[PDB]
Structures are given as structure tokens and as C-alpha cells.
Subunit: 386 residues, 5 copies
Amino acid sequence: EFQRKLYKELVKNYNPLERPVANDSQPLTVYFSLSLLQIMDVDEKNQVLTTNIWLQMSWTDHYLQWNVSEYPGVKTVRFPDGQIWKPDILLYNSADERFDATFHTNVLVNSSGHCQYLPPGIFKSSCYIDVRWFPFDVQHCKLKFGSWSYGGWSLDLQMQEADISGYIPNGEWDLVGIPGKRSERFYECCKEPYPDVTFTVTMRRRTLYYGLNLLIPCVLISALALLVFLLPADSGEKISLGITVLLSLTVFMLLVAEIMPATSDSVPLIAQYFASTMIIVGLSVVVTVIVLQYHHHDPDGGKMPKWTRVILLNWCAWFLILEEVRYIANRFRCQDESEAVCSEWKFAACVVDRLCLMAFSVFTIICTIGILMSAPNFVEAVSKDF
Amino acid sequence: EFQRKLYKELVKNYNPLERPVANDSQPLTVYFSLSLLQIMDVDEKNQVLTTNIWLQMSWTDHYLQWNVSEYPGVKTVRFPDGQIWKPDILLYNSADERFDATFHTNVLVNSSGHCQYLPPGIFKSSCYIDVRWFPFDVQHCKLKFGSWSYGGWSLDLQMQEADISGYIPNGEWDLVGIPGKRSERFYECCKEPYPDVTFTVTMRRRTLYYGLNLLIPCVLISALALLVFLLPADSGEKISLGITVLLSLTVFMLLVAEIMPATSDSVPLIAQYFASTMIIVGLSVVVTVIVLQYHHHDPDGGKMPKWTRVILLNWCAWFLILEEVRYIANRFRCQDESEAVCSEWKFAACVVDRLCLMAFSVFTIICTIGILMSAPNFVEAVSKDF
Amino acid sequence: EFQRKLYKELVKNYNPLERPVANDSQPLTVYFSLSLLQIMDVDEKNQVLTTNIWLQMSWTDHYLQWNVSEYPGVKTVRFPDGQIWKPDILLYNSADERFDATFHTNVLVNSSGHCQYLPPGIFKSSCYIDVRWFPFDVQHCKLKFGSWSYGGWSLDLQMQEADISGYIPNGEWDLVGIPGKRSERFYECCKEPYPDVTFTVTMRRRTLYYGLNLLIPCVLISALALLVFLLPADSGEKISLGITVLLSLTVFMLLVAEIMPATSDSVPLIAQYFASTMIIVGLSVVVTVIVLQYHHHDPDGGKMPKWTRVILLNWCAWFLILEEVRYIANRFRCQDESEAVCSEWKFAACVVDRLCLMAFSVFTIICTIGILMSAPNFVEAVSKDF
Amino acid sequence: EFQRKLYKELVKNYNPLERPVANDSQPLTVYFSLSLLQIMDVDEKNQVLTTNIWLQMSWTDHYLQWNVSEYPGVKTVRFPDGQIWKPDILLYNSADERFDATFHTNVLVNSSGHCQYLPPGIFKSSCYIDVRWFPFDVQHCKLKFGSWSYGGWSLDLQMQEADISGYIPNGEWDLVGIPGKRSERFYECCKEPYPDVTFTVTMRRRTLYYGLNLLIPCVLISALALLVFLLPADSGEKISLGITVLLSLTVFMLLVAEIMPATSDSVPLIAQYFASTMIIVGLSVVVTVIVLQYHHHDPDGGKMPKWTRVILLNWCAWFLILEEVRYIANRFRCQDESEAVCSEWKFAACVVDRLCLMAFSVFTIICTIGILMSAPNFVEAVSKDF
Amino acid sequence: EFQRKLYKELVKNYNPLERPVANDSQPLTVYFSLSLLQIMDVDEKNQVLTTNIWLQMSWTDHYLQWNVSEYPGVKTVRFPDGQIWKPDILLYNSADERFDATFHTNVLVNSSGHCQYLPPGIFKSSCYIDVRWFPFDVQHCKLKFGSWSYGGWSLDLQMQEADISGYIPNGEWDLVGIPGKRSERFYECCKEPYPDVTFTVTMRRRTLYYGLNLLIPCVLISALALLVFLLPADSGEKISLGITVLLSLTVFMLLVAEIMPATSDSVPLIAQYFASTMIIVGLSVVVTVIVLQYHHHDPDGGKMPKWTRVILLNWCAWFLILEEVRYIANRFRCQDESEAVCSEWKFAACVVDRLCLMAFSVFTIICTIGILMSAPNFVEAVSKDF
Ligand SMILES: *[C@@H]1O[C@H](CO)[C@@H](O)[C@H](O)[C@H]1NC(C)=O
Ligand SMILES: *[C@@H]1O[C@H](CO)[C@@H](O)[C@H](O)[C@H]1NC(C)=O
Ligand SMILES: *[C@@H]1O[C@H](CO)[C@@H](O)[C@H](O)[C@H]1NC(C)=O
Ligand SMILES: Clc1ccc([C@H]2C[C@@H]3CC[C@H]2N3)cn1
Ligand SMILES: Clc1ccc([C@H]2C[C@@H]3CC[C@H]2N3)cn1
Ligand SMILES: Clc1ccc([C@H]2C[C@@H]3CC[C@H]2N3)cn1
Ligand SMILES: Clc1ccc([C@H]2C[C@@H]3CC[C@H]2N3)cn1
Ligand SMILES: Clc1ccc([C@H]2C[C@@H]3CC[C@H]2N3)cn1
Ligand SMILES: [Ca+2]
Ligand SMILES: [Ca+2]
Ligand SMILES: [Ca+2]
Ligand SMILES: [Ca+2]
Ligand SMILES: [Ca+2]
């Protein structure tokens, strides 16, 4: 009864286009806040963050004011999208391909005129993904909200801290925080400042999954590569193992690239270490192969080039019936002679391959300690996850 | 005729914004229920549940009341979305990217004013997927329904048990149940309690498909690994078989990861067993390779390091014309001597590889019995499916 | 002219919510039919059928009746979605994620009041896919159409046979038929029966493509496996060929799984045969490997275990200067002795591998004849396609 | 000014449902044409053609007629979707899953009443893809446009030739033509003929990309297979090369299948040649393997079966101290005897493998000349592209 | 207050269809500009550019003019989509499949009547991708904006330079510029010129990512191929390494093809070099195989064909008790003779393989220098990125 009379009374001359202020010269104060419920996805490939959030717009409507005594039993009313004025607040850095993911809901109003609007949304935002310290990386993905057509002189957009009380842990990501910042900016379009509220979702990646799925294979690859660098040139399977380890490493680099963006602002350290040890082992497999097929015939066949020889040699010095039996026995002695000789090529391949092992060791230690001493602390993270 | 007169009469002063209650101070009772028709998909990768469901809202409209005698032959009327009042009930934990998948249908009303609303929907919900006990896992995926803008003081949302009479078995999933729970909650947004109805789809996975597609290959891999651990170091194909089994196991781990989420709250036991036996076999292939190329030349070459030797040895003890023929015959005797010797390295690789087999056996038994004695009972499940 | 006057006359007091019947107590007869134009897709993975169809609703509107003499030259009128009454007929088992794929078109009306409505649609329906007899399988995919809010007492939904005159052959599927069935059902929701019309698209798969793409490789794999089972244990490449055939077979099983659902109600016979011959060949490769590395040293080394020996043996029985030359000549005779011996292990591996070949042959014949004598007759199908 | 007065005047009694003709008994002439801008995609997998096109509807509105002198300065007016009458012309064979991709734009009208309507669209159409002559194939993909509810007695849909002046070459496809055909048809639905306009996009594929990406590998595979067929049975790597070439060929067949539909109306010649040479090389690898492990022991071991022997033989005929040295010398002579023998199996494998090479050559020549003499001429196409 | 009175006053007789000009004979000047915020994606496969942009339409409405003194405190008003006139400006070369990605926002108006409209959008445009100079390529992707139904006589569409002040670097692409061009064009549809504004996004690709992910493997492949060409025919692993390098190269070519379009207007130089060195190494592996199995038996077996022999030879010339011991010793001498011979086939394979290495070197140098001296300068680009 009184609800019907009130709804009829309020919409007599109401104009949804009108900014609801008694003084048209004064701006309208809008308290905009956010409630994060769940981080639904982080597409590092497309640099997209898919979140579930409830916005919170609170403002005052000078015309929607009634007296509870006049209308007993009704302390609230609801007004849908087009029946009253709502701020045109939206997400600037949206990637939704509709550019507005809000599900328009009812606006709740009470006698004093305080209007609440909590539109939910599956918001897809564009946030820059940093993979320099992968996979022990923290991402600061931004959500920039603001009014499109209402400026500071017409809409004083204030900020209230974001709400994470209802947040549901994702499992693959850990929500460090979601701080907000209200900033006043000017654009090369318009003479009025347009305030914005930027909420910076700061979240840290969880590494147990990638610790047992990815890093264990990686340590296996490293150990196999060290094993390859330990086998001598004459080893039968040192060339085969090098080749096989190469192909596995390459496949696994492609795996890393599948889930990582093509942005050139930085390179995943894991992939950089991959490529490094990759060139190192490939160079070692190639050197062993050139030593085994070109230097084999001559004890000083690979030493003919002036440069190759002097390099290796000086650098190593610095760094360290009767006649019948006659014929057959002579030929057998020649066989024995031809079967049991090694020359400076075995020693050279051992030196070169030892140098390759040393180069590989310089890279493993440096990368391991560097990833340990990363801005997203690795020691503390593993202490937490292990 | 009378239908036209009735439709004209009912919408005289009706306001769809008005909550239809004679006493505006009293809340409106809404009986919300659900009818599950088919589980359409379970994207474990994105942790999404795609279901087909018919909602069931039943309430009372004080203004839509007629007398059948006055309007003979019309016991019902239908009102579409915007012509009368419907509750703003929706799915909180939605992932639809429209955030409302309901197809708005007609509201059915009878003379007493009892209004029915059964909007169908392809609902995409966010539910946490537990893969700890994969693939013998049960999932409790939640569907949280509630009114967005109407609170307990305005909408007493009651719950009626869900309906599965029309449910169609998926084939890959078995519907254990769909119990409901009505809860009253407060939010850091608003001073009124907002009741919700949470239906917990509890469903168990079917394993015949994964029993013959996945587990049979797994047992094959395990048997091949045991075979690898049984072959001696001198075996020609023990190093090749280890490598090949490694690559197959890795591929198959990647297969598991393709269909499993990256959540770090737990690890699939199948994948954990993969990684375990993987490191075990790789360590065994590596040990055989170091024994075959570094220890080969010297009978006590690998025994030079103090630590390696003492470990193996003490632990094993605790755990257990004439002159022409002269020359040629002497050299042939030397050949015979050089061709028929084995040393402590064969025994050490047998001990080490035997220890690797023992470690692999400790893991196989433990994991097999553990998966047998899982909270989602495995013995009963196989009894059902086999 | 007269068209304008007629359009003005008809919408004087028309109410689209009103069911257009002179007697409100009587139901309205709606003849619902279907016209299938093209089967666009069959996603066996998600069990979805994507079709192009034109619905056909024919009914009678008591209020849209004019006299052609009064309005010469106008025998028809068109009314869009919201201007007049249309039945709320829709597809129950829809998977569209809008749950209504109809493109709302104009309703055609003639002087007698007979209204036609032929909304086209790309309908996505959920139909259970049976892969038991893959790839010689027929699918009965259902399309259940019905009114959502109008029951039998208000809407007598009759069925007219479906129209395939304009159907376009898909090429991968053959349309055996599309019979219809009108059924009256009750639901745990409502006191009125709600009739439905179910059209059962019965279509058979075409196998020429899969006959030359898939089955030819399969027969190749089978022949290679038989070849593996024919080679003796001492064969150099019998262990390598077994391993390679294994990996190829596994890859090809994964190919089958890529296009097949994970439903556990049945298993593709092709995949079952895969897994069978897979375990058989793997067991044979494993047996040859255990015979070649453990039994090699001793002529009765594998015969030490009591059980292994008795099994093989009894089952086979049921189933079937001078002194210098002295030294060197003696050692050469010892070499000759050591170089030219085979023992009961060659015979045992031949017996065991022969038994593996017999097991493989029992499965090939049984599966080939079974697939020949399938409910979707294979002999007639190949006669048609070959 | 005059524009406002004109817009007010025209919509006085206008009814968008009314067909705008002075004589309601006469049909309305609609000139429908098309402007193709870009072929955006050809999904051969789903048999879908994605095009960018501007429709062109031109007709006459008897009621939208003004006098320029009465309204100076306004020679045109614009009317959006629902303000005036537009024909319900749409694409019958659409695959858009909205079934109408037109972006509704303004209708342009001039004093004589001539109305223009040029709605743009990303049209997805279903067109049958012929891969028989792949990749030198031409596709005739149809676009069938027509009015849904207006028939010949009410809408005389004329055709004007399509416009390609603004067309942008795709690069992967060459637009041979886009001829149109206006046809009058009847349906098993309705008593009135419903004319249609069918534009047949006839386009030819470009093969430089597939000439250097695909065909070069193919010729490599063919040469490797010929090499395999040239190596003798005793060749060490003839069995390995055959196996490796097999696996590569299979992978590359799967590549062809990835981009080709599963339609069984025809088979890609490239894939047919693949499968042919595949069975040929596999049969040759298998024959060499049976000759190398079963016939090896006995010079007439493979000649025991009556059938195998007679076949090969007749068909080939039609087609073409002292005693110490005694012992040791005798055994060495036996070694020499056992080391240097070949028998009828080498000759038989050469004959059989030569026959396999001949079968492979019969197929290569036949397929190469056939693809040369294809309905989509290959010689002229390569002359153009090379 | 005054805002309400103003909003009521302005919409008294306003017609959104009316072009807002005092003189209907004169055209309306519309200043159209653009603000690029972020390049979201470049799908080279489908030749699509996904951008985030804010349009900027500025024009004048003769009817929306008020006096600030009459309405104090209100200097601006906002009008949504359908309440006033907006130009029908859209993107001609759109690929959105809705063909309009603009999110319709409010139109801002001030007392003088100057109307601003800044609709944001995720615009998907079709732009031709040039991969000739991959990956050091620059793309000129066009955005053609224009009015659909308003021509030059009615809409003088002027251009203002695009705004990149708020642009966010993508990371994978570098924004060289976004120049604009206003052009007047006629169409085979209409008698009036329809001006357009074309903004040409000129952007350069970043190569650090592809420099360490892609090019490093490529140089590895090249070095391995050179190594293959250095090994002699008798090398044991020269045939295996060639085969393995072949398969890796092919896989990596497929990787290039995965991210590259099938357009035949040009070929990626990287892929062309792939195919070249691929045929070269395959020809070398094939030649070594024919030399090793057909020429082996006879020292002049491959020299029998007249052509093969003369080619190689002339081109190379231009380019450069007692009797017992008797028997056994004689047979041993025959063994020695048979074991230590090479013939003109080793020299011929060295010559041929040397020629293959020379052909490979002619291609490596030519392609490396050509890519260095590309229109998108490579030396400067690497100087920037390295
Ligand atoms: C509210 O309305 C009641 C009843 O009309 C009246 O007595 C009271 O004065 C009003 N209060 C205010 C603050 O206007
Ligand atoms: C219903 O209407 C009939 C006819 O007007 C009247 O006789 C009867 O009293 C009414 N019943 C009620 C319960 O109002
Ligand atoms: C604006 O309005 C004020 C107040 O009515 C009036 O005094 C003044 O002359 C007006 N100015 C113009 C330029 O019309
Ligand atoms: Cl009508 C209008 C005026 C200004 C604007 C823009 C200024 C800031 C940046 C985007 C939006 N808010 C957009 N529309
Ligand atoms: Cl106007 C309004 C008031 C309250 C709410 C919220 C309170 C609970 C949680 C989501 C929704 N229901 C949302 N909108
Ligand atoms: Cl208002 C209303 C009443 C009944 C129904 C349901 C009964 C049958 C099954 C689905 C639909 N038709 C749906 N809505
Ligand atoms: Cl109301 C009505 C009448 C007829 C038709 C159909 C007849 C032809 C084929 C499709 C459409 N045009 C569709 N709707
Ligand atoms: Cl009503 C009408 C008239 C003309 C046009 C076209 C002419 C130019 C090219 C596309 C569009 N602008 C489109 N619609
Ligand atoms: Ca991710
Ligand atoms: Ca799944
Ligand atoms: Ca399919
Ligand atoms: Ca394609
Ligand atoms: Ca890209």
C-alpha cells in the first residue's frame, strides 16, 4: 500500500539524466569501493586478469527522500538501471570485448536519500605480467575505475578501502593485498580533471605445483648434462646422451614458452638458463664429434691449424716355415699396434669438455644463487611452501 | 474474453518495483528450489562446473487475485519479465562472464496469487576441484543462490529440497547427491542479513575409462621400470630402456598435467608417484653410466674417493721358430687376459641398482595401499566399476 | 491503404499476453513441426549436436480475423515478436549457453486467423554419444521441444512429421531418419501435464574417411606386432621393433581418445583392442628382455625358481714348440666352445613368445568378427562405402 | 528547421509493419545486391566461410515522399531499424549461432521514396569444401539470401550483380568470381513461392605457401622411400631408415588431417598417396625383416612353404705338432666358411623389394600426372605462382 | 533544480533523427580523432589487430544551447545513446563479428552546443600482416573510420591527429606511429562522396624474445648441419646426425608455421632458409647412403653409369706342416686385404658432400646478409635490443 504510494510519489518529475544535487554548482560525492571474491584466471599469454568483484557505489539523491511516519513499514526502495541516476563508472583497462562486464542490478535507497549500488562482475582487465623472476614472481595487476563523462567539478569520486573478507583463495595464487589509490588526472581531450580509483591487486604465485612438476625435471636435466660433460670423448653413449638431453631440454623450453608471453621487456631466468646450458652442451657434443671424426686418423691432425693448436697447448701449460711365421706374426704385431693407441685428441677433448663443464658450472651456480636472492624472496617462499 | 478483461483489470495500478505484500513491514516468503537436469561439463583446468538446471521460485502476490466465478474458464495467467515483480535471485559464485545465465520466462499466477517462476539455465559456477585422490575423487561443487538487493527483513528466502527426478546421468560423473542449506549471513557492506541457499552438488568420478586408458599404461611403465632395475650394468639395453622409459613417463606426466589444474593446495598422487619413480630411475641410469665410463679403466677407480668407497663397502658388509711362437702366444694370452674381467664396479652397480629397485618398491607399495585406503574408497569403487 | 486500416483495426484492444481462444476454458491447438536443413557438427567430446533447423508452429488466433472484401488486396499480415501472442516453445535439452537459439522472426497471419511461425535456429542440443561400436556407430540424438509455461489444459501441442526435403547431406554423417513422438508428462513441480514433442535424429557415421585414415594404420600396427611375435629372442631388432610399435600404438590410442568422450558407460572396441595387444606385446618384449639378460649366463638360470620351470616344462610336454701350440690351441678351442651355444632359454622364449602370438591371435579374430557382427552392421556398411 | 517539420510530417500515421505499396494487391520490388570486401576465413575443418560484406537493398516507399521546394535544403532522411519498414532479408545457410550477423544501420530515403539499406556484416556461411584435388582446389561456396516471411506475391526480390570493386585480396585465396542467381522455389511449408538470390563465391587456393611448406617435405619423403627401396636387405640402415621414414610420413599425414575435414565424399590425393606409399614401404620393411630373421639360418628356409617358393621362383624365371695345426686350421677354415655366404634369400629380398619399388613407382607417376591433369589445372596454376 | 528545468526545456521538440544544423542545406562539421591506449593483440594467423581505443567525436548542436545566467550552476549536460543525435561513425574494416565494438556512453554538451562523444572500444580490425622480413618486421595495420549513411554533403568529417599520450607499451610491439589521413571516396553504390579517416598504426616487432628463444636454436641447427657436412661418408654417426638434424629442423619449421599465416604473397626468410638447408642436408644424407650401400661392393660400381662418372671425374679435374701354414697364412693375408681398402667412392662422397657444404654456405651467407640489409634495418634493431 504505502510502498505503491511512495513509488508513485518519487517518480513524479524525476529525470534519470539529472545529477541529483540540490546545488547544481556543487559536485556530487560518490564513495566507490570494491569487494574481491575470487581471482578466476591469470592468462599470462594474453596478459589478462579475470576476477570476480562486487563494486560499491554509495551516494546521495536529494529527490529520493521520504518520511517513514508518512509511509510506515517501508524503509527502503529499489530502482533498476534506467529508472534513476547512476554514475557512469567503469573499468578503463578492460579487456572484456564488451568493455563493461557489470551485471546491472537494483539501486537501494533509504529515506535520507543514501543510494547503494553493488553491481557484480566477471571483470577481465589488462595487466602487465612480469616473468623475469619466474616462477617465484609477484604480479601487481591494476584495476582502474572511473567515471567516463562526469569530472571532478561534477563527481567527487572518493575511495574506500577494498574488502577481502569474502575472498576465496585461488590455490595457484596468493593474495598479498589490494591497496587503492585515488588520483586526479587530466587527458588530451577535455578541460576538466577526471578522478580515478586504481586498485592494485598484488598477488604472489604458488610454487609447490611448479616445484614438483617443473623444477624436478629441470634438476634432472642439469644432472644429465653434468653427466654428459663427465664422460670422455671415447665414451660410446656420450654423443647419444648429449643429443637426447638436448632434445628434451628444447622440448621443455617450448613448454615454458607455451605458458609465458612473448613480451621482450624481460626473459624468464629458467629459460635463459635453458638456452645457456643448451648452447654449452651442444658446443660440447659438436666438439666431441669434430675430435672423433677429423682428428682420429692423425695424432696431430687437429693440431695442424696454427691457432687451434697454440690455443690449446699453451693455455693448458699455463692452466696446469720360419719365414711364414715371420710374415704372419709381423702382421699380427701390426694389428696390435693399430688397436691400442690414443693421442693428444683424447686429452684435448677432455680439456675442452672439462672447460665446457666449468662454463656450465659457472652458470648453474650464478643462476641458482641469483634466483635465491630475488626481489620475490625464494628462500622464504620455499620455507613457506616446503 | 474474460482473459482479456482479467489482464486489463490486474495491471491497472500494478508497479513491478513494488514488493507484493499487504503489510509492507512484513517480509515476503519466497520458496526457492532447484531441479538438476544434466551435468554438462567439469573443467578441472579452470575449476568450472557447467550444469543445466531449472530454478523454482514460489511466492505470493497480494494484488494478483481474482475470483474464478467472475472470470470463468481462466485459472491461470502468465506475466513476462518486466510486467510484474520477480525476486532478484541469482548465483553468487557464477563464472558465466554475463553473471546471469537464466533465460527469463513467464511467471505463472493463479487466483490465490501464488506465483511460480521456473527459469532454466546453463549455469557456469566456480567450484574448487580436489585432485589429491585423483582419479578416484569426489567433488563437492557449490551453487550459492541468493537475492542481491532484498534482505531478510524484506525477503524470507526459504529452501525446498532439490529435485533430481529428471536428472540424466552424465556417464563420466556419478551424482551422489545435491543437498541444500539455507544460511543467514552479514557482509562488510550492509546492515541487513542477506539469506542464501547453497546447493552442494556432491558427485563421484567414474574410473572405468581412466582405468583402461590411463592406469593400464601406468602399470606398464612401472613394470618396465622394475625391468630396468633388474638388468645388470653390463646389459646393453639397460641404459637405453631406462632413457626410453624416462621419456615415456615424462610425456605421460604432461598428459596428467594437461587435464589437471595448477592449484598448489594438493598434488595428484599419480603424478607424485610419477615424479618419484622418475627420479629413482634417472638416478639409476645416471649411476650405471658413471660406473660404466669412469670406473671402467681401473678396478678401484671409483673407489678412490674416500667417502664413496667406505659407504658402499661397509654398508654392504653390514647389509649382507720357438721365440716367434713365444711372442705371438704371449700377446694372445694378453688379449685373453684383457677380455674376460669384471671388478668391484659390477658388484657396486648391482648393489646400488638393487638399492634403487628397493627404493622404487617402497614407493610402489606405499602409494598403491594409500590409494587403496583413500577417503573416496577405491576398493568399493573398483568393485562397482569392475 | 487498406493494409494500414487493417493493422490499426487489429491492434485496438489486442493483448499479447492473452491466449487467443474464444473459449478460455478450452485449450489452444498448436501444431508444432520441424524442418532439418543441415547437421552442422557433432562434438563427441562434449556430447553436443549442432543443427540448423526451422521450427513450424501453426495455430489459430480468434481475434486476427478480417474479411478480404472489406480489405481488398491484403490476404496476409506480419506481426513481430512482442506485438502478438506466440507460444513459449523451446528446447529443453539445450546447450547453447543462451538456452534459446531461435532468431525471432515475423508471425504470418491470414483472414481465417491461422498463424504461422517458422523461427530458424542454430540449435545446440545435448545428446548421449555411444562409442561402443566405434567407428561403425549410429547415434540417436534427441531434440525435446515443449512449452515452458503452457500446459495441456491450455496448449494442446500436436505433432506433424519432420521435413527433410531441404536437408543437405553433411558428408561425415548420414541421416537415417528424424522420427517424432508426442508424449504427455508430469514433473515434480506442477499439477498440470506438460506435453512435449521429441524428434530423434537417427544418423549413421561414414567410415571411408576413417577407413583410409585410421584403419589402414591400425592394420599396419597389427601386422608389425605379429612380426614382432614371429622374431626369435636372439633377433637383434625384435626388442627395438617391439618398443617402437608400442610407442606408435600408444600415440594412436591417444589419437582415438582425443576425439572420444571420457564417458565410462562403454569403451571403444578399437581402443580396447589397442590396450589388449599393447599389454600382450609389452609382456612379450619384457619376457624376451628378462630371458636375454638374466637367463643368459646359466643354461638353467631361469629354471632355478621351482614354479617358473615346472610351468614351462610340464606344460610344453603336455602341449607337444709342441706345448706352446698346445696352450694356444686349447684356448682357441675354449673360444669356439664359448661362441656357439644356445640353451633352454631360446626354446623357452620361443614357447612364451609363441604363446603371446597365440593370445594376440585369439584377440584379433574375436574383435574382428565381433565388429563385423555389430548391431550397426559392418559388412553392409563397407559394402555401401567400398 | 525544415528537417524537423519533415520528420514530424512523415511519421504521422506511418506503420513499420505495413508493406509500403499504394496497391496492396501488387508486390513490392526489392533490388537486392551485395558488395564483398574481404574473405576473412575458410575453416575447412568446420566447412565455414567467414566473409565481410555490405548488403544492398533498394526499394520504394510510397508514403515517404516530400517536395524539395516545400522543405528546402533536405534531400534525404535517415530512419533506423524499428521506425520504418525494412525487408526481412537474411542468410538461409548461416552458421553464425545468432543466425543474423547484420549490423542494423540507418535506412536512407529521398523525395521520390527510394529507400537504400546497406547493412554490413561478418557473415559466417556453411559451404561444402571439396578436398579431392587438394591443395590445387577451387571452392564454390554459396550465400543464399532471401526474405523469410514475404513471398513472391508480396516481395519481388530482384538481383543486381555483386560488387567487388572494394574487395581486398586475402592472400591465401584468389577470388575468381561471385556470380549471382535469382531462383523461385516452393517449400513443404507454405503455398506461396519464396524467391531467393544465391551468390556463389568461386575462389581458388594459392599454393606457393603450401608449395614450399608442404610439397617440398613430401618430395623429400618420396625420395627417402625410393632410397629405402634401393638398399639391399643386408644393408644395416635399410630397416632403420624405413621405420623412420614411416613415422615421419605418418606424422605428416596427421598434419594433413589436422586442416582437412572428415567428410567421406572424397579423399585428398596427397593423403591417398601417403597411405599408398606407406603400406608399400611398411610391407617392404616387414618383408626384409621376415627374410633377415626367419630365412637366415637355412639357405632354403623360406622356400619350404610350397606357395611362397613357387611364386617367387617361377615368376622370376618368367620375368627374367702336425695334428695340432690340423685341428686349429680346420676350425679356422670352418670359420671362414661360416662367414662368407649369401643364399637365395638375398636374391629373393632384392626381387621382392625391387617389386615394392616398382609398385611405389607405378603410384608416384600415376598420382603426379593425375594431379597435373586435374580439373583445377595444376600446370597453369604453377606457371602463375612460379 | 535548474538542471531539471534545463533538461525539460531541451527535449521539448528535439528529434534524434534530425541532423542538428540551422541550415539544412549546409553540411555538419564533425571533428573525429582517436586515442590509442594499448595494443592488446596481433593475431598474425587470422591477420587481426585487437586494440583499445577511445574515439573522439566533436560537433555542434544548434538546438542544445542555453544561457548560464538563466540556468546557474549547470555548464554541462549528458545525453545517452538514443536521446539525441550522434553520427553513425564506425570501423569499416572490422572483424569483431558484431561489427561495432563501441561501448555507447554519454554525450557531453555545453552551452555553446559543442557536443563531445568519446566511446571506448576493444576494436578488432583486419590488417594485412607482412612476414617477408620475419621476425624483424614492421606492420602498417589500418583503421578506417567513417560515417555509414551520412555523406560529404551532410557530414564534413574532419581529422585531428591521434593521441598516444596515454598509450601503454605492449612489450612485444613498439609503436612507431599512428598517422591519420582524411580521404574523399565514391563507391559503386551511391551518388554522394563518403569521406573517411584512416589511422595507420605503424608498429615494429621486438626481437629479444625471439632472439633468444628462436634464433639461438636456429644457429645451433645451422652449426649441426655444417658439422654433418664436415663428417666423411665412413663416419658412423654422420647418417644418424643428418637424420636427427633433419627431424629437428622440420619440427622447428612447423613451429614457425604455427604462428605465421598461410598467405602466399610472401614467404618468411627464416622458413625459406629452413627449407633450403633442409633439402641440402637431405640430399647429402641420401647421397652418402647411396654411396655407402650401392658403391660399396665394387671400386667402380657407382662409376658404371656413363653420366654420373664423367660428371664427377672431369668436373673434379677442372675444379682441382709347411703346407698347412701356407693355407692358413694365405687366408689370413686375404682377410688383411679385404679389411683395409677405400676407393673412389670415399673421394666422390667427400667431393659431393664438400659441394653440398659449399651450396649450404652460399645460402647461409646470402640469407644472413640479406636479412641484415632489410628494409626494417636489422643492424640498428639489434643495436637497440642488444
Ligand atoms: C513525518 O510525518 C509525520 C506524520 O505525517 C509527522 O507527524 C512528522 O512531523 C513528520 N516528520 C518530519 C521530520 O517531517
Ligand atoms: C465470486 O463471484 C461470484 C459471481 O460474481 C459471486 O457470486 C461469489 O460470491 C464470489 N465469491 C467470492 C468468494 O467472492
Ligand atoms: C542570459 O540571461 C540573463 C538572465 O536572464 C540575461 O540578463 C542576459 O541578458 C542573458 N544573456 C544573453 C547573452 O542572452
Ligand atoms: Cl563525454 C567524455 C568526456 C571525457 C571522457 C574521458 C576523460 C577521462 C578519460 C576517459 C574519459 N574519462 C569521455 N567522455
Ligand atoms: Cl543494493 C545491494 C545491497 C546488498 C548487496 C549484497 C549483500 C549480499 C552479498 C551480495 C549482495 N547480497 C547488493 N546490492
Ligand atoms: Cl511457470 C512454469 C510452469 C511449469 C514449468 C515446467 C514444467 C515442464 C517442465 C519444464 C517446464 N515445462 C515451467 N514454468
Ligand atoms: Cl511466416 C514464414 C513463412 C514462410 C517461411 C519460409 C519459406 C521460405 C523458406 C524459409 C522461409 N522462406 C518462413 N516463415
Ligand atoms: Cl544508406 C547508406 C548509404 C551509403 C552507404 C555506404 C557508402 C560508404 C561505403 C559504406 C557506406 N559508406 C551505406 N549506407
Ligand atoms: Ca594461467
Ligand atoms: Ca573435464
Ligand atoms: Ca566431431
Ligand atoms: Ca583455413
Ligand atoms: Ca601473436
